[PDB]
From a paper:
Tipα, therefore, is an important pathogenic effector of H. pylori that promotes host inflammation and tumor progression. The active form of Tipα can bind the gastric epithelial cells and subsequently be translocated into the cytoplasm.
Here we report the crystal structure of the N-terminal-truncated Tipα starting from the residue Cys25 (TipαN25) that retains both inter-molecular disulfide bridges. A homodimer, linked by inter-subunit disulfide bonds at the N-terminus, is present in an asymmetric unit. The whole structure of TipαN25 homodimer resembles the shape of a pair of tongs, with the disulfide bridges as pivot and a pair of anti-parallel β sheets as jaws of the tongs to clip targets for its functional performances.
Numbering used by the authors:
A (entry chain A): 34 to 181
B (entry chain B): 35 to 181
The structure:
Amino acid sequence: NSFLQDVPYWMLQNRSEYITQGVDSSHIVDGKKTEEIEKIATKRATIRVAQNIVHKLKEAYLSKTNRIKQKITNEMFIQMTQPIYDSLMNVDRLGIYINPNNEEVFALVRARGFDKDALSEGLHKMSLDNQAVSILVAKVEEIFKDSV
Amino acid sequence: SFLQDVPYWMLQNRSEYITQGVDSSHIVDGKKTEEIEKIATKRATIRVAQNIVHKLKEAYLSKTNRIKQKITNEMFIQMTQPIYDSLMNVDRLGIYINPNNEEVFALVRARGFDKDALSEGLHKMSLDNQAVSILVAKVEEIFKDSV
């Protein structure tokens, strides 16, 4: 009953709770080279960090210390994923890992920052009031500074 | 931050047993966990097929190979279908969801296969008689050596 070998520690962890760090995979599409399945896995991972940020935001919203009075529907929160992803910058691929069982590529990624203008603008197009946007931007702002 | 309840099998290369396979499926909208589990299970079952093809391709490319007919890679790949088709009594030994990305993994093992099924399927594929006989023989071995 031999166990897998050469398995990075980050794979044994729940990185998605660093919020700015996301892990995701991609099955090896046949017609593609490993290098490309890594591209796909990396995008997914960075999208994941976006979702991580949204999940953190949705948490604070549903928190009892939430100051946002506008109603933000579950669907809206999913919408936020896009503007947030759009604003991410300086995203490093910290690692890759391929599981032998099914040849699936995993990628560890970290977004080092985001454009405040970009996020703000994006959130505004989404139909949140000024107060909400200010608070939301203020929060992903803290999520990032508090991530170092 | 270490993942808590990770099954032991998730830490092993289960496709080492050939008749066992592990594969996954990403979570998906409109889809409940229950059916992403169904999807992962089928992919895992296909792995078993793939594991079996991979094992045959090994013996075919080994020194002790007796199949004189040449079998291309595209052929070996298509050998997957008939093998999968013939699988029977496939049990789902486990399910594991990775918190990092809500991806469902599934562990399965095919307890058997139908000689007739595989044979017929292999013949349709364009292998000579001796080729089929040997391959079906080898797949027999694979399953007995997994008990």
